Amino acid sequence: QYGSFCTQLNRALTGIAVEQDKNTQEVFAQVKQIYKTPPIKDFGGFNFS
Amino acid sequence: QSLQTYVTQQLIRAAEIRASANLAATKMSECVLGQSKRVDFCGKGYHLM
Amino acid sequence: AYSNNSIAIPTNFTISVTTEILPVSMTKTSVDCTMYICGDSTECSNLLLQYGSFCTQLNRALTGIAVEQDKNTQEVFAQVKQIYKTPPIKDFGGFNFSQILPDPSKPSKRSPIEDLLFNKVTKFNGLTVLPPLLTDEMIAQYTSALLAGTITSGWTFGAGPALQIPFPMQMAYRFNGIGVTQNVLYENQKLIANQFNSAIGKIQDSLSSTPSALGKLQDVVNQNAQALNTLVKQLSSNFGAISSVLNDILSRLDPPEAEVQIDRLITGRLQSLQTYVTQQLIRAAEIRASANLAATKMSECVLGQSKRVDFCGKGYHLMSFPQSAPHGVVFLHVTYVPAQEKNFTTAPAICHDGKAHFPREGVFVSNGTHWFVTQRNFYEPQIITTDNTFVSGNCDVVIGIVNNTVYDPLQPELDS
Amino acid sequence: FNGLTVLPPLLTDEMIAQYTSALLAGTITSGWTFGAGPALQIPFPMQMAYRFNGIGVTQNVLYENQKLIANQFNSAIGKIQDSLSSTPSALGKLQDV
Amino acid sequence: QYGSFCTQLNRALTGIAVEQDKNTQEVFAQVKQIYKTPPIKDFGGFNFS
Amino acid sequence: KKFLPFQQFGRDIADTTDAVRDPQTLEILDITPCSFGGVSVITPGTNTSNQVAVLYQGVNCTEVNVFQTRAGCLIGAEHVNNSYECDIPIGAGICASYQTSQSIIAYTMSLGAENSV
Numbered sequence: 216q217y218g219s220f221c222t223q224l225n226r227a228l229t230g231i232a233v234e235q236d237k238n239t240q241e242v243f244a245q246v247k248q249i250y251k252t253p254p255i256k257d258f259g260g261f262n263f264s
Numbered sequence: 265q266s267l268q269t270y271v272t273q274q275l276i277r278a279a280e281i282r283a284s285a286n287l288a289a290t291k292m293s294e295c296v297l298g299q300s301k302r303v304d305f306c307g308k309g310y311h312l313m
Numbered sequence: 314a315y316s317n318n319s320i321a322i323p324t325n326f327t328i329s330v331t332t333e334i335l336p337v338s339m340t341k342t343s344v345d346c347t348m349y350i351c352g353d354s355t356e357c358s359n360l361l362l363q364y365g366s367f368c369t370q371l372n373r374a375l376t377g378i379a380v381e382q383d384k385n386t387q388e389v390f391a392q393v394k395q396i397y398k399t400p401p402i403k404d405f406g407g408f409n410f411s412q413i414l415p416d417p418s419k420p421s422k423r424s425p426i427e428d429l430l431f432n433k434v435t436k437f438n439g440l441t442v443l444p445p446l447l448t449d450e451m452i453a454q455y456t457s458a459l460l461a462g463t464i465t466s467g468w469t470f471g472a473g474p475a476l477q478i479p480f481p482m483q484m485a486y487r488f489n490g491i492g493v494t495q496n497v498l499y500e501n502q503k504l505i506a507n508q509f510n511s512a513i514g515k516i517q518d519s520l521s522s523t524p525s526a527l528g529k530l531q532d533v534v535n536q537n538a539q540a541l542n543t544l545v546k547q548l549s550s551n552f553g554a555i556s557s558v559l560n561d562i563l564s565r566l567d568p569p570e571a572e573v574q575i576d577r578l579i580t581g582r583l584q585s586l587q588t589y590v591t592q593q594l595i596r597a598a599e600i601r602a603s604a605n606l607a608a609t610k611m612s613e614c615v616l617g618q619s620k621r622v623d624f625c626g627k628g629y630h631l632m633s634f635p636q637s638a639p640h641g642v643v644f645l646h647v648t649y650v651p652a653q654e655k656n657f658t659t660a661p662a663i664c665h666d667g668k669a670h671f672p673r674e675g676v677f678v679s680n681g682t683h684w685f686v687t688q689r690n691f692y693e694p695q696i697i698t699t700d701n702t703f704v705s706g707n708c709d710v711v712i713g714i715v716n717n718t719v720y721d722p723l724q725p726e727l728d729s
Numbered sequence: 730f731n732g733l734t735v736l737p738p739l740l741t742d743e744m745i746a747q748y749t750s751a752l753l754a755g756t757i758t759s760g761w762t763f764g765a766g767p768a769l770q771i772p773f774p775m776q777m778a779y780r781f782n783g784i785g786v787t788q789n790v791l792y793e794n795q796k797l798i799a800n801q802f803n804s805a806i807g808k809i810q811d812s813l814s815s816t817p818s819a820l821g822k823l824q825d826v
Numbered sequence: 827q828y829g830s831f832c833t834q835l836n837r838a839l840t841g842i843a844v845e846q847d848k849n850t851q852e853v854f855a856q857v858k859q860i861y862k863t864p865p866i867k868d869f870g871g872f873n874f875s
Numbered sequence: 876k877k878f879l880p881f882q883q884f885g886r887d888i889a890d891t892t893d894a895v896r897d898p899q900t901l902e903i904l905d906i907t908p909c910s911f912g913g914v915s916v917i918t919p920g921t922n923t924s925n926q927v928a929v930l931y932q933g934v935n936c937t938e939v940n941v942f943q944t945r946a947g948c949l950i951g952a953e954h955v956n957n958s959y960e961c962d963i964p965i966g967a968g969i970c971a972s973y974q975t976s977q978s979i980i981a982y983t984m985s986l987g988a989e990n991s992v
């Protein structure tokens with residue numbers, strides 16, 4: 216009897232869940248080429264291990 | 265009423281997290297992928313990487 | 314292919330134009346709280362006044378949103394005080410701007426691209442829509458002035474007065490701002506102009522080809538339409554009352570028990586407006602942030618040359634051209650992308666007389682046997698001379714320093 | 730179990746680690762070139778020389794002090810491990826969320 | 827009988843009040859040390875008084 | 876419209892009834908809401924003048940020195956051909972101001988002085 220009061224709450228939370236996956240992608244998926252370092256880690260004395 | 269209060273809080277909190285995600289994406293584009301000249305954007309001192 | 318003595322330097326490049334679409338304003342919807350809840354009903358209105366300023370506060374919040382939407386458009390587009398126009402001369406060094414410049418042979422003078430943007434985007438129970446302060450024609454004039462200033466005056470029209478400059482010479486600045494020497498432009502001007510013209514033509518097809526490109530602007534329209542469609546549908550709900558129609562309760566019940574059923578409708582409908590207004594305020598905050606970002610981008614990428622990575626497209630930013638869009642703005646970002654690269658062996662310094670020589674600009678590279686110095690962003694080998702390198706320290710300190718010879722241009726002048 | 734469910738993120742933890750590893754590898758081996766265009770290899774101390782000139786310090790300061798700079802960088806990273814694994818309030822922003 | 831509805835409202839306003847003090851701390855307390863100008867006002871003709 | 880003979884009412888995308896069939900005469904009649912809209916008062920500061928102009932939002936100038944605008948019917952403000960900087964926004968490019976003898980005027984706002992490089 217309350218119409219869309221229930222349904223639109225499900226829609227609102229669904230929008231957040233999609234946005235959360237969007238937020239991760241814009242932050243981390245900024246490369247689109249999986250680069251690898253060389254097997255011999257020799258970077259002029261800089262230790263990145 | 266309890267759900268509407270909960271959903272509204274989630275919507276407002278999602279906006280804050282989205283702003284942080286946008287800032288994180290901006291930093292990784294500018295702090296990681298480049299060399300930012302913005303003061304204190306990539307920490308104290310003159311940014312290198 | 315990392316190693317301690319190998320560097321890759323581009324030998325060629327391409328002009329890429331990317332499209333960034335940002336929403337700027339929402340639909341200026343205004344809702345009459347009294348008419349929505351108690352339309353044409355004096356008795357229902359007398360019950361509404363028992364809730365105090367509930368109705369008035371809801372109207373005030375929507376009014377604040379509507380004023381803000383005009384503010385959002387003003388900051389994004391009205392960043393120029395003078396309306397600049399391009400001359401009838403279109404000699405810009407071979408760069409063809411006719412597809413982003415206003416088309417005068419058509420109603421509502423717009424660019425071919427702007428019309429494509431507009432063609433791809435799609436008052437009842439107290440709900441009306443208010444027109445924006447700036448019409449589409451007025452926004453097109455703002456983008457035309459910003460476009461004309463960028464082409465004919467570079468970034469000078471933003472910082473101050475519009476100082477005319479030949480566009481090829483303007484592009485020479487844009488090269489020098491990303492670390493590529495001016496001569497790369499003039500030697501390759503025909504190639505660069507052709508690549509720019511082809512990229513603009515691709516934008517016309519790309520936006521047209523895929524109909525989901527302008528989804529960012531269509532999402533704003535869809536969400537606002539859904540909010541109002543949900544709002545009207547709530548009028549048919551009973552919320553516990555005998556009938557969603559007020560006239561079917563008053564004329565089917567004595568007032569003493571008719572007010573019990575009507576009190577369930579005012580509560581339901583007033584709560585529906587509060588849900589709608591709260592959603593609009595939250596959505597308006599998102600649009601305001603997008604409008605602030607759009608205003609920032611036009612200030613820093615259209616009125617100047619941003620050095621922020623990925624702020625205005627992949628590659629190295631040069632310049633952007635704004636385009637009008639319904640409920641938003643579209644930026645065309647022109648950048649340099651290095652395209653063809655070769656593996657070169659490199660060295661950090663070179664030993665000539667025991668003294669360490671470092672390049673003032675660029676990096677040392679060897680083509681197997683000969684050593685040269687070239688700019689890092691474009692392969693252009695130069696003979697290593699005292700006018701290209703500076704002296705600091707000696708060869709016993711620098712790690713990886715190699716032996717070669719510096720040509721001194723003054724020695725043969727003195728000998729001859 | 731009151732109608733409340735949690736959905737898994739689209740990218741898992743090991744997938745985000747791959748993205749960071751790719752960004753880490755590109756930064757170390759190619760500088761800023763992997764972002765703007767293709768990953769152009771460059772020796773790392775040569776890349777630091779570019780980082781020197783971006784802040785107004787002539788690159789010869791690096792090569793003359795390369796051993797000192799590498800040692801100080803290595804020590805600073807080690808301090809990050811100690812500080813993060815000692816202070817129980819450093820990662821408050823993630824815990825507060 | 828309405829449960830935590832009262833308590834949640836107090837908590838939300840408390841979070842706002844704490845955020846306001848944080849707002850002033852990031853904007854203004856960007857310098858660790860309190861610098862003062864000398865009694866000499868010879869700044870090349872620039873009047874900062 | 877041509878309603879099917881059984882159909883007696885017309886419905887909107889939402890729930891509003893737009894069309895109906897008259898019972899006596901079989902002609903079809905479409906309904907429309909009795910006009911309504913907001914009444915904004917356009918005023919300068921009362922410390923300067925007590926003269927005001929009234930804007931009726933989203934209505935014609937027949938249901939209500941009259942200037943018809945897209946934002947609605949404006950009454951009391953004079954229509955001026957000359958453009959100026961926007962002072963009191965009305966909508967659809969129209970702004971109002973109190974200018975010299977003095978009266979409230981309405982005009983299409985100027986976007987700035989034109990120039991050429």
Ligand SMILES: *[C@@H]1O[C@H](CO)[C@@H](O[C@@H]2O[C@H](CO)[C@@H](O)[C@H](O)[C@H]2NC(C)=O)[C@H](O)[C@H]1NC(C)=O
Binds near residue numbers: 256262263264807
């Ligand atoms: C980088 O530093 C790490 C330590 O921060 C070094 O790892 C050490 O390796 C030695 C073996 O040679 C072990 O005895 C130590 O216990 C290790 N320390 C840790 C914390 O793992 C590593 O040697 C350095 N990398 C290089 C290439 O020098």
Ligand SMILES: *[C@@H]1O[C@H](CO)[C@@H](O[C@@H]2O[C@H](CO)[C@@H](O)[C@H](O)[C@H]2NC(C)=O)[C@H](O)[C@H]1NC(C)=O
Binds near residue numbers: 327508
């Ligand atoms: C850089 O690459 C472009 C291609 O993107 C080269 O231009 C092409 O050159 C070929 C000849 O080899 C022509 O057939 C094409 O018509 C050219 N295309 C365009 C768009 O002009 C360009 O010559 C290269 N530059 C350098 C210095 O190598």
Ligand SMILES: *[C@@H]1O[C@H](CO)[C@@H](O[C@@H]2O[C@H](CO)[C@@H](O)[C@H](O)[C@H]2NC(C)=O)[C@H](O)[C@H]1NC(C)=O
Binds near residue numbers: 410
């Ligand atoms: C800029 O490019 C447009 C095409 O994008 C050129 O206009 C074309 O001109 C040719 C020859 O007159 C016509 O056959 C085409 O129909 C035109 N195409 C379009 C889409 O208009 C235009 O001439 C170029 N500008 C300049 C000054 O050369």
Ligand SMILES: *[C@@H]1O[C@H](CO)[C@@H](O[C@@H]2O[C@H](CO)[C@@H](O)[C@H](O)[C@H]2NC(C)=O)[C@H](O)[C@H]1NC(C)=O
Binds near residue numbers: 680681682683
């Ligand atoms: C490296 O570049 C140098 C300079 O361009 C090359 O030396 C020239 O080679 C040409 C033949 O292709 C001769 O005609 C010139 O007289 C040479 N100039 C000098 C100064 O020696 C050299 O061959 C190149 N080496 C490689 C491996 O590419």
Ligand SMILES: *[C@@H]1O[C@H](CO)[C@@H](O[C@@H]2O[C@H](CO)[C@@H](O)[C@H](O)[C@H]2NC(C)=O)[C@H](O)[C@H]1NC(C)=O
Binds near residue numbers: 664716
């Ligand atoms: C670069 O050239 C210098 C001299 O111009 C070389 O220095 C010589 O080193 C060798 C072997 O260590 C000695 O036999 C010579 O006596 C040194 N020269 C002097 C002036 O004493 C240096 O080795 C060269 N670099 C390379 C790798 O060939």
Ligand SMILES: *[C@@H]1O[C@H](CO)[C@@H](O[C@@H]2O[C@H](CO)[C@@H](O)[C@H](O)[C@H]2NC(C)=O)[C@H](O)[C@H]1NC(C)=O
Binds near residue numbers: 874
């Ligand atoms: C900085 O400017 C202020 C005024 O802006 C100067 O203060 C004036 O000092 C004179 C004395 O020579 C007084 O007669 C004026 O009334 C002062 N004006 C004000 C507004 O205070 C001040 O002298 C300037 N600073 C210096 C060191 O020259």
Ligand SMILES: *[C@@H]1O[C@H](CO)[C@@H](O)[C@H](O)[C@H]1NC(C)=O
Binds near residue numbers: 656
């Ligand atoms: C450089 O050499 C690597 C091998 O280590 C190879 O994979 C790469 O394709 C080469 N680059 C060019 C431009 O030839």
Ligand SMILES: *[C@@H]1O[C@H](CO)[C@@H](O)[C@H](O)[C@H]1NC(C)=O
Binds near residue numbers: 257317318712713
């Ligand atoms: C570079 O690496 C090689 C190993 O492949 C090594 O022999 C050489 O000494 C290194 N040079 C420098 C300057 O680190």
Ligand SMILES: *[C@@H]1O[C@H](CO)[C@@H](O)[C@H](O)[C@H]1NC(C)=O
Binds near residue numbers: 922
């Ligand atoms: C506005 O009117 C007041 C009268 O209350 C007067 O004191 C004040 O000076 C006026 N200000 C202007 C700017 O006209």
Ligand SMILES: *[C@@H]1O[C@H](CO)[C@@H](O)[C@H](O)[C@H]1NC(C)=O
Binds near residue numbers: 935936937
């Ligand atoms: C209603 O307004 C329009 C302008 O949009 C006008 O053409 C029309 O004549 C008006 N209606 C009447 C009855 O005057």
Ligand SMILES: *[C@@H]1O[C@H](CO)[C@@H](O)[C@H](O)[C@H]1NC(C)=O
Binds near residue numbers: 954955956
């Ligand atoms: C504007 O000027 C035209 C003549 O070009 C005239 O017909 C019209 O009435 C004027 N409008 C106003 C509002 O003064």
